[PDB]
C-alpha cells in the first residue's frame, strides 16, 4: 500500500536552567523506530523498532551528528522567535517541527510535508506544491520573506522528493511484514446495566494496526452519531491500538443496535450485536 516517513522535533527553552532541550522521534506509518534526546547521559540516536537495530554503528553515529546540529539550529530559531514576539528571556517557549514524505505503492512521492509550530500554534508550513509558504501571522511573515529571498523551498523540495523517499524505501525493505501488514481489530460488545430501562452497550476494537479506524452505532440501520460516545484511539503499548464506542439503550431493546467497524485489515466492515 501507501507509506509515510515523518520526523517530529521538539525544542523547549529553559530560561536559567541551561540550553534548550531537543527531542526527536522518527516514524514509518504508525510505527516509531528512532529517538534522540539531548538530555540523555550520552545523547545518541537510539532504535525503537526491531527492524532498525540491524543498522551498523555508522548509521547511529551519523544521525547523532545531524541531531546535534539540528538542536543548535533550533536554539537560534528560538532566539529569533523571542525577538519577533517581544518576549522575555525569562519565559520558556516551544518550537515544534514535522517533515517527511508520503509515497504510493509505486514508491514515488505523493505528498511532502515540512511545517512548524511555535508555543503550540501553527507558525509556518510548506504548501503541498512544495514551492510556496503559508504563514500564520505577521511574525511568521518575517520568516517567510527570509526563506523566499534565499529560495530555500527549492532545497526542501529536493530533500522531500529525493532522499526522504529513498530512506523510506529502504526502511520498508528492512521491515517486511511488520510494516506492510494490517492487523485487524479483535472486536466484541459488552453490556453494562445502568438501571431499569437503561443499559450501556460498549463496542470494542482491540489490537489493531494501523491506528485509523471507524466505529459507529446504528439503530435499525440508521446512524446514532449525536448519541454515540467515542473515546480517542489509544495505544496498547505493543505497537497496536484500541478504541471503543458506547450508546445508552432502552433495557430489553439491546438487540435493535448494531455496531459497525471499518479498518484496513477488514476487507468487509464488521457488524456486531449484543446477543
Amino acid at each position: 500500500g501507501s507509506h509515510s516517513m515523518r520526523y517530529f522535533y521538539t525544542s523547549v527553552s529553559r530560561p536559567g536552567r541551561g540550553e534548550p532541550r531537543f527531542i526527536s522521534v522518527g516514524y514509518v506509518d504508525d510505527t516509531q523506530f528512532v529517538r534522540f534526546d539531548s538530555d540523555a547521559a550520552s545523547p545518541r540516536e537510539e532504535p525503537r523498532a526491531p527492524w532498525i537495530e540491524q543498522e551498523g554503528p555508522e548509521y547511529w553515529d551519523r544521525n547523532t551528528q545531524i541531531y546535534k546540529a539540528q538542536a543548535q539550529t533550533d536554539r537560534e530559531s528560538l532566539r529569533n522567535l523571542r525577538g519577533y514576539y517581544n518576549q522575555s528571556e525569562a519565559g520558556s517557549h516551544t518550537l515544534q517541527s514535522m517533515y517527511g514524505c508520503d509515497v504510493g505503492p509505486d514508491g514515488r512521492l505523493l505528498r511532502g510535508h515540512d511545517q512548524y509550530a511555535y508555543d503550540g500554534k501553527d507558525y509556518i508550513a510548506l504548501n503541498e506544491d512544495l514551492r510556496s509558504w503559508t504563514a500564520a501571522d505577521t511574525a511568521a511573515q518575517i520568516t517567510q520573506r527570509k526563506w523566499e529571498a534565499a529560495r530555500e523551498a527549492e532545497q526542501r523540495r529536493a530533500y522531500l522528493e529525493g532522499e526522504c523517499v529513498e530512506w523510506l524505501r529502504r526502511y520498508l525493505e528492512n521491515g517486511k511484514d511488520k510494516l506492510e501488514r494490517a492487523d485487524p481489530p479483535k472486536t466484541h460488545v459488552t453490556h453494562h446495566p445502568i438501571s431499569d430501562h437503561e443499559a450501556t452497550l460498549r463496542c470494542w476494537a482491540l489490537g489493531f494496526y494501523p491506528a485509523e479506524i471507524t466505529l459507529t452505532w446504528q439503530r435499525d440501520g440508521e446512524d446514532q452519531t449525536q448519541d454515540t460516545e467515542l473515546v480517542e484511539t489509544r495505544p496498547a503499548g505493543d505497537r497496536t491500538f484500541q478504541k471503543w464506542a458506547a450508546v445508552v439503550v432502552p433495557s430489553g431493546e439491546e438487540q435493535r443496535y448494531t455496531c459497525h467497524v471499518q479498518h484496513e485489515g477488514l476487507p468487509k466492515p464488521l457488524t456486531l450485536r449484543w446477543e
Binding site: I66, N80, W147, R156, W167
Partner: peptide, 9 residues
Amino acid sequence: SPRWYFYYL
C-alpha cells in the same frame, strides 16, 4: 534518517 540541511526561522 534525519535531514542534514538546516534552516533558521
